[PDB]
RNA sequence: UACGGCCGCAAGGUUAAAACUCAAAUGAAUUGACGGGGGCCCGCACAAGCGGUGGAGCAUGUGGUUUAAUUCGAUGCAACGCGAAGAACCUUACCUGGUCUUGACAUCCACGGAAGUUUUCAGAGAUGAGAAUGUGCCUUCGGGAACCGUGAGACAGGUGCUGCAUGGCUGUCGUCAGCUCGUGUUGUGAAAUGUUGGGUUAAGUCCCGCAACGAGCGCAACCCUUAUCCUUUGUUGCCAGCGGUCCGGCCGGGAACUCAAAGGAGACUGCCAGUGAUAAACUGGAGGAAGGUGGGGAUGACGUCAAGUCAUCAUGGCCCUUACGACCAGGGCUACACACGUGCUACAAUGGCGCAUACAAAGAGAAGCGACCUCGCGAGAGCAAGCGGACCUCAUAAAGUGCGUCGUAGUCCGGAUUGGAGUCUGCAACUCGACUCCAUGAAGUCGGAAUCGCUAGUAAUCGUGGAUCAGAAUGCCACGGUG
RNA sequence: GCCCGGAUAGCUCAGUCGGUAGAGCAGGGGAUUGAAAAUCCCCGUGUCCUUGGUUCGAUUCCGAGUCCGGGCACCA
């Protein structure tokens, strides 16, 4: 290890937190824990809704929710479906009139999580590393942008000896503040190992 | 530099001179050494102002010099100014604990006199 | 302050309180084992320890939950 | 290491005004606890009067006289043994060091207190005494004394 | 080389094999590593000084040695006040003994039984053998759900082994200036060039040059924080004016000022001069509160050490399973007959001691911080307000300065040790705690060989707070005074 | 068998007019080293071979013994 996280280290500048909000130690306790627990779930029923991130406004006993997803019809549900699910599910797991505002993520090639998630959706999916890694995600080049770093872990393909990729396009100076990437992770628990990846998306400058 | 207030024990070592201390002994002066870290092997000059005056710390939990004696003269006194016959025996200058005052008790009763 | 897991005691004085409790109270247990632990149960209790020359009374407290019954018990005279 | 500004400079005593005075004080200064330095010093150094009768004021830099060598060694990793190569000793330091001497061996001295143990010291220092005077001639019998290097 | 021949005075020469053995031996050239090779550089590396460690007593850890156990790990700079920001039980993983084998922790099934509370005895306890008290609801009166019992098994369980099976995470060269790529060109090729050279900078920073032209990870700059002023708002903060004083900004009042804290201006070699090829840059200078990345943080390239961690967690494989699983009690991790590293306090009048007294910062706090007041010599206890916070509390700084003293002795130094008796935490402090009082008052009179840190608010010294935490800090993190 | 000598630290040795004995090495604890050495610092638990005697007192002095070492055992 010798990095700095390239989105906590901007959390100041450039970059907004994924769940702003006021509380005191008394309830701060408990309160970024049920954020875990709803933000956890609302993953699991939803995985292949191609969620983004998922921000958690917080006035008054009444927290927003927002799930950002490039696939927000899907998210949406039979006209009512998953939403209500949603909404409802978001009961004694917060204890108040929790609310629910989907957002819709323009170019799913640009934002990390996605270039993420995906990639290694892909390796699940028996598919060679450097083809999805390097092609797969070029994408995030086309649609624009200006710089992607990617990375996967080791143990890609038949290998005891683990092994760290690079392929990276334009320029990603995750050395200046001013800069703002879009970093973000990803697993996949294959066969043997969990090959990881990092998302590296350069979008623009200041 | 003198810890508990006067005289100053140096080039000797520690416990050693510790007990120095009109209050501590072989074993209590060298009881205090331990969870203070300081060695004994070690002359108070060695040391340092987070060495030396670091006994100058767990001394104050015993009592010591002058007050000390007066302490023990009063306390002793309580239980002498009542007729006991140790105290009776207390202020003659005689054996309190059990020795034979009827003879050889030259540093008890004190010098001759013929 | 020496036992980790398995706060131990010395059996002999431990089938005695279970058998004073039993039928109530009573006088003193004779003990030689001090190297055992006060005991909770033995709470207001009497017990005696073979300081070398003869016994001691013991009557256990509220607080005297894990520590070693010979603490109670001095051994040398002095003074 | 390459590095090259100027000296710090000093505030001078807490009278006379003097940096030759100051760096004094300084040198003395122990534990930080500046304020004994002077109230150690600055009294010894007037006590002089019980010791003359005067405008003491001079006698510092006179006592110094007799303290303030000209020469030094300076062994030099060289000719594959260690030179020894005697220099002088430029006025900046020639100052400073005499009071190292003047303090640093006042303290061994073993009198009353440091106080007067320092006094007595200036006195013997003009009129030649103590290690103070002896480290000087102590040390010239190296430099100018051995020339064959220098 | 042997043997044979020939030559020789003799050294020995000349001619010249085999057995057996290996999968190579070898030549030049390339990349790099290294050199007790050379040139040029930077870093508290050295030199210049300031203070230390090495001796001393005590703290802490480690190797030893021991132990029933002294739980496992960390071991050149990168190990040792390290995982532990906190070992009396617990923790715990270790030892001893008692005890439990679908099991302490998860689900599935069978049949039962409310959960719950008070409870008696046997026991160190783990537990077992009994007395009650207890019946909530889905009611389609089969069945049920949470939970409890016990029976069977798939299993559950492992701080067990491999960190040369791994993920994740970390230290290190090193904040070092380095590490590469595309294309083009060069050699048969590994490979080179670029990226070298000349200046220059903190720097592969920049400016020229040049078979290279450009690009990426880096360096710089964005982030914080500190240094000036401005806009704005004015409680618990402020008091310049005016006024009223139960003299305290206490009370009207006042948004000025300190401060608070959201947003702004300011520093760029921008301007002046000289050097340099009339370039980069350097050297000074003006203006400013602040110069030449303002000070300090944060930020750690490509990779190296099969470096560290399966013991936080996760996990391949291997292991154990009526037991390297699990419960209780006590004991151990604080043992010693030595050593090594990191610390605190001294060895003293640049001081102690009495009295007096002035100055700061950043911080914590509902099983909390705790006032005032009362008791006690004191630790602390009783009673009980305030603050859940610029309102109150922990907190009413130390150095310092005034006076006086003691006068260089082992002291009026320094406190180790021990005894006497006491407090507070907590079932409980023998083992093994913090502190108070009284008495005891040692070594030590500045420390070889050798060695460490430190370039400015620095080293040096002086206090203040906090994490862990019921209660064991001289350790760690952090703040300000003097300098 | 005879005469002369030795027996002292783990090894090889030095030493004493009679009272408490050492050196080089090995050994051990520190150090320095990445680690070993080499080097630096600090460290002797010797019943002075046995057994008799002199003596207040024996490693030392006297007698003897074992062991080792040197020499000798010849005419026949």
């Given at each position: 290890?010798?990095?700095?996280?390239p989105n906590?280290?901007?959390?100041?500048?450039?970059?907004?937190?994924?769940?702003t909000?006021?509380a005191?130690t008394?309830?701060?306790?408990?309160?970024?824990?049920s954020?875990?627990?709803v933000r956890?779930?609302?993953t699991?029923?939803?995985?292949?809704?191609?969620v983004?991130?998922?921000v958690i406004?917080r006035?008054?006993?009444s927290?927003?929710v927002?799930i950002?997803?490039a696939?927000?019809?899907?998210?949406?549900?039979?006209?009512?479906?998953?939403?209500?699910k949603l909404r409802?599910?978001?009961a004694?797991?917060?204890g108040?009139?929790?609310?629910?505002?989907?957002?819709?993520?323009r170019k799913?090639?640009?934002?990390?999580?996605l270039?993420?998630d995906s990639?290694?959706?892909?390796?699940?999916?028996?598919?060679?590393?450097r083809?999805?890694?390097?092609?797969?995600?070029?994408?995030a080049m086309?649609?624009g942008?200006?710089?992607?770093?990617?990375?996967?872990?080791?143990?890609?393909?038949?290998?005891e000896?683990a092994?760290?990729?690079?392929?990276?396009?334009g320029?990603?100076?995750?050395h200046?503040?001013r800069?703002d990437?879009?970093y973000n992770?990803?697993?996949?628990?294959?066969?043997?190992?969990v090959?990881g990846v990092?998302?590296?998306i350069?979008?623009?400058?200041i | 530099?003198?810890?508990?207030?006067?005289?100053?024990?140096?080039h000797?070592?520690?416990?050693?001179?510790?007990?120095?201390?009109?209050?501590?002994?072989?074993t209590?002066s060298?009881?205090i050494?331990?969870?203070?870290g300081?060695?004994?092997?070690?002359?108070?000059?060695?040391?340092?102002?987070?060495?030396?005056d670091?006994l100058?710390?767990?001394v104050?939990?015993?009592?010591?010099?002058?007050?000390?004696?007066?302490?023990?003269?009063m306390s002793?006194?309580?239980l002498?100014?009542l007729?006991?016959?140790?105290?009776?025996r207390?202020?003659r200058?005689?054996p309190?604990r059990?020795?034979?005052?009827?003879?050889?008790?030259?540093?008890?009763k004190?010098?001759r006199?013929? | 302050?020496s036992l980790?897991?398995?706060?131990?005691?010395?059996?002999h004085?431990?089938?005695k309180?279970?058998?004073?409790?039993?039928s109530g109270?009573?006088?003193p247990l004779?003990?030689?084992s001090?190297?055992?632990?006060?005991?909770?149960?033995?709470?207001?209790?009497?017990i005696?320890?073979h300081?070398?020359r003869?016994?001691?009374?013991?009557?256990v407290?509220d607080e005297?939950?894990?520590?070693?019954?010979?603490?109670?018990?001095p051994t040398?005279?002095?003074? | 290491?390459?590095?090259?500004i100027?000296?710090?400079?000093?505030?001078?005593?807490?009278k006379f005004?003097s940096?030759?005075?100051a760096?004094?004080?300084?040198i003395?200064m122990?534990?930080?606890?500046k304020?004994?330095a002077?109230?150690?010093v600055?009294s010894?150094?007037?006590?002089?009067?019980?010791?003359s009768?005067?405008?003491?004021?001079?006698?510092?830099?006179?006592?110094?006289e007799?303290?303030?060598?000209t020469?030094?060694?300076?062994?030099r990793r060289?000719?594959?043994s260690?030179?020894?190569?005697p220099?002088?000793?430029?006025?900046v330091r020639?100052n400073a060091?005499?009071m190292?001497?003047?303090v640093?061996?006042?303290r061994?001295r073993?009198?009353?207190?440091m106080?007067l143990?320092?006094?007595?010291?200036?006195?013997?220092?003009?009129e030649n005494?103590?290690?103070?005077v002896?480290?000087?001639?102590?040390?010239?019998?190296?430099a100018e004394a051995?020339?064959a290097?220098?």
């Amino acid at each position: 290890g010798q990095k700095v996280h390239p989105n906590g280290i901007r959390l100041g500048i450039v970059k907004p937190w994924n769940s702003t909000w006021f509380a005191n130690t008394k309830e701060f306790a408990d309160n970024l824990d049920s954020d875990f627990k709803v933000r956890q779930y609302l993953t699991k029923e939803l995985a292949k809704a191609s969620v983004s991130r998922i921000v958690i406004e917080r006035p008054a006993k009444s927290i927003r929710v927002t799930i950002h997803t490039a696939r927000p019809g899907i998210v949406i549900g039979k006209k009512g479906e998953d939403v209500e699910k949603l909404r409802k599910v978001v009961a004694d797991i917060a204890g108040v009139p929790a609310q629910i505002n989907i957002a819709e993520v323009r170019k799913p090639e640009l934002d990390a999580k996605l270039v993420a998630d995906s990639i290694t959706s892909q390796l699940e999916r028996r598919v060679m590393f450097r083809r999805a890694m390097k092609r797969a995600v070029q994408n995030a080049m086309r649609l624009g942008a200006k710089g992607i770093k990617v990375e996967v872990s080791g143990r890609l393909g038949g290998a005891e000896i683990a092994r760290t990729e690079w392929y990276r396009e334009g320029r990603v100076p995750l050395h200046t503040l001013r800069a703002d990437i879009d970093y973000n992770t990803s697993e996949a628990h294959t066969t043997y190992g969990v090959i990881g990846v990092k998302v590296w998306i350069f979008k623009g400058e200041i | 530099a003198r810890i508990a207030g006067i005289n100053i024990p140096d080039h000797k070592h520690a416990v050693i001179a510790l007990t120095s201390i009109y209050g501590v002994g072989k074993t209590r002066s060298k009881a205090i050494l331990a969870a203070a870290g300081i060695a004994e092997d070690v002359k108070i000059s060695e040391l340092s102002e987070g060495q030396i005056d670091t006994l100058r710390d767990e001394v104050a939990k015993f009592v010591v010099e002058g007050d000390l004696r007066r302490e023990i003269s009063m306390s002793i006194k309580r239980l002498m100014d009542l007729g006991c016959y140790r105290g009776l025996r207390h202020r003659r200058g005689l054996p309190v604990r059990g020795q034979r005052t009827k003879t050889n008790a030259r540093t008890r009763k004190g010098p001759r006199k013929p | 302050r020496s036992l980790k897991k398995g706060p131990f005691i010395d059996l002999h004085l431990l089938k005695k309180v279970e058998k004073a409790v039993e039928s109530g109270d009573k006088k003193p247990l004779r003990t030689w084992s001090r190297r055992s632990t006060i005991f909770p149960n033995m709470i207001g209790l009497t017990i005696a320890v073979h300081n070398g020359r003869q016994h001691v009374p013991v009557f256990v407290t509220d607080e005297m939950v894990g520590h070693k019954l010979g603490e109670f018990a001095p051994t040398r005279t002095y003074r | 290491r390459r590095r090259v500004i100027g000296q710090r400079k000093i505030l001078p005593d807490p009278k006379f005004g003097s940096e030759l005075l100051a760096k004094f004080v300084n040198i003395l200064m122990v534990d930080g606890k500046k304020s004994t330095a002077e109230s150690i010093v600055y009294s010894a150094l007037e006590t002089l009067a019980q010791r003359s009768g005067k405008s003491e004021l001079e006698a510092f830099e006179v006592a110094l006289e007799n303290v303030r060598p000209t020469v030094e060694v300076k062994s030099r990793r060289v000719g594959g043994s260690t030179y020894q190569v005697p220099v002088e000793v430029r006025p900046v330091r020639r100052n400073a060091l005499a009071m190292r001497w003047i303090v640093e061996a006042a303290r061994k001295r073993g009198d009353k207190s440091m106080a007067l143990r320092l006094a007595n010291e200036l006195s013997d220092a003009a009129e030649n005494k103590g290690t103070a005077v002896k480290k000087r001639e102590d040390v010239h019998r190296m430099a100018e004394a051995n020339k064959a290097f220098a």
